[PDB]
């Protein structure tokens, strides 16, 4: 009947919100990718402070992509947007050192709660595998500095094999990267 005049609209609202949200997710994912790119430079250590500040602006753009929030229905776009962020950020930390490394998604939801919030559960434990990737990147940058990456990846691994398995796809490839690393720290000591 003339019912659907309210249905099509009623869901079209969702179509729109999802689209704009995907906009903000593109902007956040790439805007963050650039930050880790910056952290690829190794030089000096200005990139660290400038980078942390920039991330703090991405807390303003995240502030934006939560602005229109009143659930998982839209969490689909939470792709790279939310994942990439966790990666670059956690990277800031686990190369900021020189061992938590360090954040913890609850502290993150705590700096996001200042947005007054974007829920932050398993997307975290994913973004941190992506951070394993990142550490691998810092190391591969080298060539006395890979060792840190090795210890880091052995701890991460022990902490990612440690749970219930989805993620098997991430954890497998992570094991492979830990083998890369371990093989390098090994080849060093001829």
């Amino acid at each position: 009947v003339q019912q659907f005049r309210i249905y099509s609209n009623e869901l079209i609202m969702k179509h729109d919100r999802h689209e704009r949200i995907v906009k903000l997710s593109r902007d956040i994912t790439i805007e963050s990718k650039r930050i880790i790119f910056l952290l690829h430079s190794i030089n000096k250590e200005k990139v660290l402070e400038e980078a942390r500040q920039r991330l703090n602006k991405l807390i303003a753009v995240n502030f934006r992509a939560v602005a229109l929030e009143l659930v998982y229905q839209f969490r689909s776009s939470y792709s790279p947007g939310l994942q990439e962020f966790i990666e670059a950020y956690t990277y800031m930390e686990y190369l900021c050192h020189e061992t938590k490394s360090v954040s913890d998604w609850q502290a993150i939801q705590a700096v996001m709660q200042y947005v007054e919030f974007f829920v932050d559960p398993t997307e975290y434990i994913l973004g941190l595998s992506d951070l394993t990737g990142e550490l691998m990147r810092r190391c591969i940058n080298s060539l006395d500095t890979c060792l840190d990456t090795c210890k880091a990846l052995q701890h991460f691994y022990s902490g990612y094999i440690s749970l219930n398995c989805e993620l098997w796809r991430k954890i497998t490839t992570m094991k492979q990267s830990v083998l890369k690393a371990e093989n390098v720290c090994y080849n060093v000591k001829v």
């Binding site: 659907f4 005049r5 249905y7 869901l11 659930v71 061992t99 902490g159 440690s162 749970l163 219930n164």
Partner: protein
């Protein structure tokens, strides 16, 4: 770095994922009754009235269980575990959508349906009936009414193919007015079924 809590979160999730599954199952049976009743109507017409009183008798039960599924859902977690009850919810929406065509000459709507399944409408009200589930529960109705039109013709009724063809005509139109997700394919299938019912309606010229 202490993944005790890290994993314990999902470890608390799973239990829930189960406590809802039991519900999904008992409901599955509840609607299995109705479904059998409606599969009865392709064999004998003089059962209609009964099959209604019975099916509805079943539904006033479903809702009661659905409320149990309601309090299990903490605030905004509907779309976190929904995937368990949607495929069933659609079978109910369909049951309804059938009964109210067998009693009256039209279909029910989001509101009318939710009020029966003891559910709400907007996510803000609380546990609700996602419009999608409604729509999907609606489509199946057609592929049913095709077989039911065929049979109801095997049994002497010349009016069934007509009525049904009008019903599906308007339904189709209504699903055409919607955006030009993954329900589109189902709409195409609907197109097919309309074609079939039209064929049948023509064939009633002898």
């Amino acid at each position: 770095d202490i993944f005790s809590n890290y994993q314990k979160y999902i470890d608390n999730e799973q239990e829930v994922r189960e406590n809802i599954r039991i519900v999904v199952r008992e409901i599955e049976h509840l609607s299995k009754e109705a479904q059998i009743k409606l599969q009865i109507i392709h064999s004998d017409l003089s059962q209609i009235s009964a099959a209604c009183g019975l099916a509805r008798k079943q539904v006033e039960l479903c809702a009661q269980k659905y409320q149990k599924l309601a309090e299990l859902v903490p605030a905004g977690q509907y779309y976190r575990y929904s995937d368990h009850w949607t495929f069933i919810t659609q079978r109910l929406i369909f049951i309804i959508a059938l009964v109210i065509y067998l009693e009256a000459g039209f279909l029910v709507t989001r509101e009318t349906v939710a009020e029966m399944l003891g559910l709400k409408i907007s996510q803000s009200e609380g546990f609700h009936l996602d419009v999608e589930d409604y729509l999907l529960g609606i489509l199946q109705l057609a592929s049913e009414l095709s077989r039911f039109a065929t049979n109801s013709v095997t049994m002497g009724d010349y009016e069934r193919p007509l009525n049904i063809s009008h019903f599906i005509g308007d339904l189709n139109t209504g699903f055409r007015l919607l955006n030009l997700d993954g329900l589109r394919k189902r709409f195409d299938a609907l197109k097919y079924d309309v074609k079939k019912i039209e064929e049948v309606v023509y064939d009633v010229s002898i």
